[PDB]
Write a protein that binds this ligand. Structure first.
Ligand SMILES: CCCCCCCCCCC(CCCCCCCCCC)(CO[C@@H]1O[C@H](CO)[C@@H](O[C@H]2O[C@H](CO)[C@@H](O)[C@H](O)[C@H]2O)[C@H](O)[C@H]1O)CO[C@@H]1O[C@H](CO)[C@@H](O[C@H]2O[C@H](CO)[C@@H](O)[C@H](O)[C@H]2O)[C@H](O)[C@H]1O
Ligand SMILES: CCCCCCCCCCC(CCCCCCCCCC)(CO[C@@H]1O[C@H](CO)[C@@H](O[C@H]2O[C@H](CO)[C@@H](O)[C@H](O)[C@H]2O)[C@H](O)[C@H]1O)CO[C@@H]1O[C@H](CO)[C@@H](O[C@H]2O[C@H](CO)[C@@H](O)[C@H](O)[C@H]2O)[C@H](O)[C@H]1O
Ligand SMILES: CC/C=C\C/C=C/C/C=C\C/C=C/C/C=C/CCCCOC[C@H](COP(=O)(O)OCCN)OC(=O)CCCCCCCCCCCCCCCCC
Ligand SMILES: CC/C=C\C/C=C\C/C=C/C/C=C/C/C=C\CCCCOC[C@H](COP(=O)(O)OCCN)OC(=O)CCCCCCCCCCCCCCCCC
Ligand SMILES: CCCCCCCC/C=C\CCCCCCCC(=O)N[C@@H](CO)[C@H](O)CCCCCCCCCCCCCCC
Lengths: 642, 642
């Protein structure tokens, strides 16, 4: 009437050593009775119950329950017509008892006014603590009783229970059995219960004894004892032979993140700290650089004083303190030494980045050098020069020092003339740099790396959240419990995409506000298309999190896969160094990576202000869309023939 | 009397809603009998057994087992005089049955010859599969049977068993109970067993009924039954009121890593390919940049051909193809456009990086400009210049393009002299750079980031490996099982340090071999001192993983703690950018970070060849040692009061 199983096979393990849990099996459960399923091992009964509710799909079998096959649109197994208690405690923490009751009632479509009566009745009957207590703050027995109350709340016509009374007090166990007997009799309710107390299953109506994947007997307990003349059942076994369902899922997802402070800090406060620290340390020009100066045109007094005095008008008095007046104060500090040997010794230590030497004949030789032109003898060309020894072990510092020293002389050369009706253009190399077409004369390395930092934060934090949430929830039977309740797989997936979309929108707003408004990173292009590209890259990472969760079953295995691809793609996507420095063969391969073309597209919009119509901009838009499709296809193809 | 317990109080919960697991409880176990604990809930029995074996301590009470308090002298609890079967399966996977028995027998000091006989007897007795099957490849019942065999193998005088028979067939249950009765037959053996099947405890000599954290009664089963004529125990419970243990651990640790392929890929193959990709993509100079050339001194033919021809001796034929002959071909690609306006349009698209635009009067004006000197009119000063419009949105590209355009003119100017029998020194700016004190004239950025990629890989690979290994083993109960076998915490920590030290030595060798011997990263200092500092940073990360494992209890919490400190310290340790770019306040704070002074010390040795005697070199050695002491102090304090 209620359940009928015929020829049900199932096995686990490899082909060489298979663990046969189920073999040729026959079961018939009458409507309106308590059945009772006793077996030597707890795995076969669990597999049978999971196949009955329709969540395991055993091979080469036949299950008929409440109209037809589970989940076939001819029966009512997935929905409010059955009440399922799993073997594990498939309950959400950080939720009170009343909140759990309300959530599961909203899933089953009960009115909020008729849920309170059931909640109070179950609280009184099952000896439970206050309804405001969090589930994670309860003990194992209390949590199991709360799960039982959840299974009993909606009054189903079929109850499938997996060890409801395992560590319950004998008085409470007796009361529970009396309640089950009462609701079963004089009604249309059927109970299928598996227990370890064989004697306790004496009020049951049709005991089915399970052994070696088959049923040794299935018949009334009293009559079974009558046939063999036994006073206990123990020695008989000794045989030597749908929108409202989306609000509930959406509300639950937002409350789980809000009540986890550590989760809120990792996905919202961690990105802000990286942006703040990156904009304060990476890309700025060094400023604290010390140079050793040996000016032999002036008396030496101290390592911090030189008395650099000269007449600013004309007559070219010193021309060596005049040159040092044009040195940029922001990046270079000046220290003074008495000998070139002692100044060089400072550079050989960590006391200076370079040494400058002026001979006592510098002024006269320099004045004569410009007055002779191409007729200057080698003597005046020797004494009219500044000897510079530099520490070039640091690439960025050496570039700054050389550029500042050279640009300081250009200002010095253009300052000597100009008041004498001489155009400063006489002191220019024929190679003349006009106004830059893009950018300025002082480009910043922070502006080059900033586009890649934004995309990597949004992409890789969507992989971690999606992979962990789906793996954890699937591994403790939380998805399976909701599927039996009548929640379709398309509704669960829809609610996950919406929740992740809102999360990544908050991250995008926070990252862009600090980078642009606070730290002054330039954005020459349209900010509308900058947001769209950032959101699309976040959705690309979410689809990659579907792939990881579809192939991994432990959380420790998922993080290794994520970190195993987070490192190689960072070094090949041109985030910290220009892509033009790579070898040609490696450069071509890198263009097919998920983030390479999008980082280039974002950089052009921020640094050059290019529009969406430029090929270099929309090429990164299309590469993100293709990777989204590829990631979704890979995740589906895992289950296509499996 | 084997066990005596008096007034043992224990609870598990918060002060607001305490969960009193134990209350005033008295328990007495006699020598040579079977004692059965038959509590209603498994929390009290498990806690009592754990307190008896010493792995847990209760708030107030007294425990006396086999001579005294467990864990101290006199008592023989943590040793081979007891046999413990924990509630959960505490066996190592990836190990065969035989290897498990040999490992545990080696722990107990038994000879390899007597372990074989016990293994054969237990395999025959417990109906276990072949001895060569891996533990991870068995079902949930065979694993429990192997755990029971491990408990029984070394023949102890006191057996503490936590549900030895739960899913066992009754046919095997009868044999197991018969074996227990036969071994406990007028001897020194004592068995304490908790079972769900109350009637199976009829063969036990004493029965202890547990309820509400105490014992309702403690008497023989037959005396208890003959109190009012009861014929079963169901109604009775219805009441309303050191050289050889380190070697074994060392061999086990290396075998677990070798038999986990995914573990060796993450810690040995990932760092090698991370170094390879860094040395191929990061730090190199762009070498494919395109420039649009407008040369009106010659006819226009194509975008790839120009017919640049000139004489080499004298007479200054064209001087525009002579300058373009001095351009570096390794980094600049020349494209030709017919008009200056069309060449700028190429730069406004992604087709070029700059424009040159030689004027049709360049040759005549350049020779007149260099033959007049200070008497050059503005007309020849305008026609003799090269007008460069550059794309300056990229900082590193703009440095290369400007540097190469100006150095190619220096060779061009030096070539014009000498061919005219003139001094080449006449084309020198009075700022003359001598031979560098450190480094060369062409510094590399990949030589700046290499000292700091080595340290980052070694440091953070020890945090992840140490934290995961210690957290997983404590949760699964393997650590507690080995403590009751007589393995002190000193040898567990000693064997873990040696295993991590060998792993970090292999990582160091692989990183330095590929970075220096294969990719040619310079090492001007002592290689031996470079090795010492790298290993020192590895041990520093190991001690940081000790703190994380002592604080966290789940692997997902430890990963977020490690990643939450990996991101900030990397951006503040001067790895990818010089430390001189950040503000002074931020630079002061960053010097106290674990990896900041060590990165500076390693860079000095590799790039300058400095010795250990230099203050900039041995500050990184002292900063690393101090952080090791601080990390070992924090972890010890955490375990002291938590
Ligand atoms: C777009 C997708 C929408 C989905 C939105 C929903 C997502 C929420 C997922 C929640 C989640 C995933 C975290 C994912 C990490 C993300 C980064 C990835 C990792 C980086 C690569 C957070 O996980 C929780 O994080 C907490 C952080 O606060 C942590 O708390 C710790 O640190 C705190 C801080 O210091 C500190 O104060 C606190 O003391 C610490 O305990 C919890 O221990 C930890 O479990 C896991 O949920 C957890 O599941 C647990 C049982 O599995 C569940 O345990 C309860 O339930 C059972 C009986 O009912 C039973 O098991 C337990 O007896 C019971 O307790 C927890 O209740 C639940 O929370
Ligand atoms: C300093 C020296 C320390 C000691 C040596 C260190 C290693 C010791 C711990 C080893 C360890 C932690 C590794 C984490 C370290 C790195 C994390 C860093 C994180 C970075 C952020 C690796 O864990 C292994 O990782 C495997 C990866 O290969 C993975 O296998 C997966 O991918 C494979 C690939 O194809 C694929 O074939 C395979 O099918 C996949 O499953 C499994 O999870 C596991 O085998 C955990 O050990 C595991 O413990 C498991 C019980 O929990 C134990 O479970 C087994 O047995 C149980 C019977 O009690 C039974 O109940 C379980 O059902 C059964 O499964 C595993 O057997 C054992 O191995
Ligand atoms: C950023 C995006 C970049 C690229 C995107 C994509 C490319 C392709 C798109 C999809 C294809 C693949 C994704 C990855 C999959 C691949 C499939 C198969 C894995 C299935 O994984 C099963 C279990 C987990 O299985 P389990 O948990 O036990 O569940 C039971 C199921 N059997 O993995 C584990 O343990 C492994 C744990 C980490 C293993 C390595 C970590 C780091 C790698 C470093 C090594 C690199 C060097 C290369 C080695 C060669 C040199 C000798
Ligand atoms: C290279 C780096 C080296 C050194 C760095 C520097 C200094 C080192 C001094 C180190 C000492 C300690 C650090 C540990 C501190 C303290 C304990 C806490 C957790 C103890 O733990 C509890 C459970 C785990 O507890 P549980 O697993 O449940 O076990 C039960 C035990 N109650 O953690 C969790 O959930 C946390 C999961 C991730 C939380 C955040 C992740 C990323 C942080 C980003 C936020 C940054 C911005 C700050 C926010 C302020 C502005 C609003
Ligand atoms: C997807 C998995 C990650 C989950 C969480 C992702 C959330 C956001 C990610 C980064 C936030 C953006 C903040 C910096 C990320 C991108 C921006 C940047 O500036 N990146 C550079 C510096 O961070 C770049 O990474 C430099 C690498 C050179 C050194 C390489 C050594 C690598 C060690 C390998 C072994 C250590 C293992 C430790 C634990 C094993």
């Amino acid at each position: 009437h209620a359940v009928c199983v015929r020829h049900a096979f199932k096995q686990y393990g490899s082909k060489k050593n298979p663990n046969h849990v189920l073999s040729d099996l026959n079961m018939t459960v009458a409507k309106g009775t308590i059945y009772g399923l006793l077996g030597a091992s707890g795995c076969g009964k669990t597999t049978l119950l999971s196949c009955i509710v329709g969540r395991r799909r055993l091979n080469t079998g036949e299950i008929w329950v409440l109209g037809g096959k589970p989940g076939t649109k001819g029966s009512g197994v997935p929905g409010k017509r059955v009440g399922y208690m799993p073997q594990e405690i498939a309950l959400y923490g950080e939720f009170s008892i009343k909140e759990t009751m309300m959530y599961f009632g909203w899933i089953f479509g009960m009115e909020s006014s008729e849920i309170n009566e059931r909640l109070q009745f179950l609280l009184n009957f099952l000896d439970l603590p206050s309804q405001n207590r969090l589930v994670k703050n309860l003990s194992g027995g209390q949590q199991r009783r709360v799960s039982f109350a959840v299974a009993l709340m909606h009054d189903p016509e079929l109850l499938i229970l997996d060890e409801p009374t395992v560590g319950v007090d004998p008085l409470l166990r007796q009361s529970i059995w009396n309640h089950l007997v009462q609701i079963t009799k004089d009604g249309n309710k059927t109970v299928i219960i598996t227990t370890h107390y064989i004697e306790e299953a004496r009020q049951a109506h049709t005991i089915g004894l399970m052994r070696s994947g088959k049923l040794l007997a299935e018949e009334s307990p009293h009559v079974l004892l009558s046939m063999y003349g036994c006073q206990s059942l123990e020695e008989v076994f000794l045989k030597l032979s749908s929108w409202g369902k989306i609000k509930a899922l959406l509300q639950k997802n937002f409350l789980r993140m809000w009540r986890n402070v550590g989760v809120m800090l990792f996905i919202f406060a961690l990105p802000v700290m990286q942006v703040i620290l990156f904009c304060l340390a990476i890309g700025r020009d060094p400023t604290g650089l010390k140079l050793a100066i040996v000016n032999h045109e002036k008396n030496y007094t101290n390592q911090s004083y030189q008395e650099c005095s000269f007449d600013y008008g004309c007559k070219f008095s010193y021309l060596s303190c005049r040159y040092l007046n044009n040195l940029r104060n922001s990046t270079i500090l000046k220290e003074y030494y008495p000998d070139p040997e002692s100044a060089v010794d400072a550079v050989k230590q960590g006391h200076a980045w370079g040494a400058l030497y002026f001979t006592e004949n510098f002024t006269d030789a320099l004045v004569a050098r410009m007055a002779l032109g191409k007729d200057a003898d080698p003597e005046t060309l020797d004494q009219s020069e500044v000897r510079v020894w530099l520490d070039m072990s640091n690439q960025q510092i050496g570039i700054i020092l050389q550029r500042d020293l050279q640009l300081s002389y250009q200002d010095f050369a253009k300052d000597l003339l100009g008041a004498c009706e001489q155009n400063p253009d006489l002191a220019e190399i024929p190679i003349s740099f006009k106004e830059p077409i893009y950018g300025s004369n002082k480009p910043s390395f922070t502006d080059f790396v900033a586009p890649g930092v934004i995309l990597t934060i949004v992409f890789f934090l969507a992989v971690a959240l999606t992979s962990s949430a789906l793996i954890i929830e699937r591994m403790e039977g939380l998805l399976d419990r909701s599927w039996v309740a009548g929640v379709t797989p398309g509704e669960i997936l829809f609610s996950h995409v919406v929740t992740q979309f809102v999360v990544m929108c908050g991250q995008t707003a926070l990252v862009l506000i600090f980078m642009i408004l606070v730290f002054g990173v330039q954005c020459k292009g349209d900010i509308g298309w900058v947001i769209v590209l950032t959101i699309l890259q976040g959705l690309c990472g979410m689809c990659f999190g579907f792939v990881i969760s579809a192939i991994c079953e432990l959380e420790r295995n998922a993080i290794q896969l994520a970190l195993g691809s987070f490192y190689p793609t960072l070094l090949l996507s041109g985030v910290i160094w220009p892509i033009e420095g790579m070898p040609t063969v490696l450069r071509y391969v890198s263009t097919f990576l998920p983030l390479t073309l999008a980082t280039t597209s974002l950089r052009a919009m921020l640094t050059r202000g290019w529009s969406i119509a430029e090929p270099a901009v929309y090429y990164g838009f299309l590469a993100t869309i293709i990777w989204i499709v590829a990631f979704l296809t890979i995740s589906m193809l895992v289950l296509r023939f499996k």
